[PDB]
Amino acid sequence: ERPTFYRQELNKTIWEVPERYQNLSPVGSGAYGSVCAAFDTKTGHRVAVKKLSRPFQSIIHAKRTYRELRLLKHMKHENVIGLLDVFTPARSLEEFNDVYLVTHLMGADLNNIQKLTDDHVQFLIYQILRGLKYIHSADIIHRDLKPSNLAVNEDCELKILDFGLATRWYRAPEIMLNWNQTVDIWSVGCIMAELLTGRTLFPGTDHIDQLKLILRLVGTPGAELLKKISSESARNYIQSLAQMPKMNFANVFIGANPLAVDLLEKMLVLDSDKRITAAQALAHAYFAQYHDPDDEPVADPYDQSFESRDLLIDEWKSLTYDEVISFVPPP
């Protein structure tokens, strides 16, 4: 029982969407790609419709499209973006070439929310950790967490997403030198610090400067962590730099809530085996007033075996088409 579509141009781009979506207006200045705001006549709420660009232009684009659809269909959590609809005007695989995604209309990102109160930071970071506990439990690593990938509405309700299109300021040092899930926790540490102080914690100009700033705070690796670098070039570099002491975070986040400081000490550790996880962090005393261990769920298992597959462009397209058809809309 297929719906009725209607076509229209919008800023040198064609849009064929269910009549159920109306009053489409472009949002961003193309920053988010081809995205419009909309009114959903089924529900009566604003939505965001994104039309992918050249989704099957190449083998790599076909796989990235399939990956994005598969991940979005899996996410069912209050602090993670979710898929409200996915559709295509095509009536059969032979004419399938465009893919539309429908999500909630997000309010503003965390860059667009002056420092916050300590209570505001607790709530926002709490919600990020809660969604991270959920994606991490599915063996899903975000990898690109940063204020522009956090959406927050007027109730300060937060959702994690990934718009795609600097990342380096938030990036774990191990995956910037190539020597697990807690790369995301490092980024939370950087975000949390910024909310507290009002300043980018590690505003590095490139990768070597980014590492220089990081070690000035957390200190040069010790032999405990040195014993775990396999990359021989990485070891030589770190041992050649000037030995800089670990700073005491209380002298750097002066005046901040000492629970917040203690949590920063547990997130912004160089050794990834010692970094706090999302689930452990939810139990930190700093979130004492939001922590609810009975309402911090994990995710269903996520089959990502496809990621190790080499398929042709038309096969990835077919699989994307499967996921479009099999899609069941939520409540």
Under rule CB under 6 A, residue 68 binds ligand TK5: yes
Query: What phi, psi does 307 have (nearest 5°)?
Result: -65, -25
Contact call for residues 17 and 24 (beta carbons, < 8 A) = yes
Helix (H, G, I), strand (E, B) or coil at 45: strand
CA–CA distance, 203 with 164 (Å, rounded to integer) = 20
User: Is 21 annotated as a binding-site member?
Assistant: no
**Two structure tokens written together for 81:** 């973006």
| Closer CB to ligand TK5, 82 or 219, in the complex | 82
Q: Tell me which stretch binds ligand TK5 (CB under 6 A): 5-13, 117-125, 160-168, 195-203.
A: 160-168
CA distance 183 to 197: 22
CB-based contacts of 292, cutoff 8 Å, min separation 6: none
Beta carbon nearer to ligand TK5, 136 or 218: 136
Count of residues making up the chain: 331
Q: How far is the CB of 187 from ligand TK5 (least distance, A)?
A: 12
Nearer CB in complex with ligand TK5: 38/238:
38
Q: Examine residue 290 and tell whether it contacts ligand TK5 (CB under 6 A).
A: no
Instruction: Respond yes or no: is residue 162 known to be catalytic.
Output: yes
Q: What is the helix (H) or strand (E) element at residue 187, kind and residue range?
A: helix 183-197
Q: Which is nearer to ligand TK5, 47 or 215 (CB)?
A: 47
- Least separation in angstroms between residue 103's CB and ligand TK5 is 4
CB 122, min distance to ligand TK5, A: 22
Q: List, in sequence order, the alpha helices (H) in 5-89.
A: 59-74
> Residues 178, 131: contact at Cβ < 8 Å?
no
Which residue among 150, 160, 260, 324 contacts ligand TK5 (CB under 6 A)?
Answer: 160
Q: How far is the CB of 74 from ligand TK5 (least distance, A)?
A: 8
Q: CB burial class (10 A; 0-12, 13-18, 19+) of residue 313? A: middle
User: Is there binding between residue 71 and ligand TK5 (CB under 6 A)?
Assistant: yes
Subset of residues 186 to 225 that bind ligand TK5, contact rule: CB under 6 A:
none
Angle between helices 118-137 and 258-267 (to 10 degrees): 30
Q: Binding of ligand TK5 at residue 35 (CB under 6 A)?
A: yes
Question: How far, rounded to the nearest angstrom, does the alpha carbon of residue 22 sit from its chain's CA centroid?
Answer: 29
Among 5, 24, 26, 32, binds ligand TK5 (CB under 6 A): 32
Q: Which residues are annotated as a binding site for ATP?
A: 27-35, 50
Catalytic residues: 162
Binding interface with ligand TK5 (CB under 6 A): 27-28, 32, 35, 48, 50, 64, 67-68, 71-72, 75, 80-81, 101, 103, 105-106, 108, 135, 140, 142, 151, 160-164
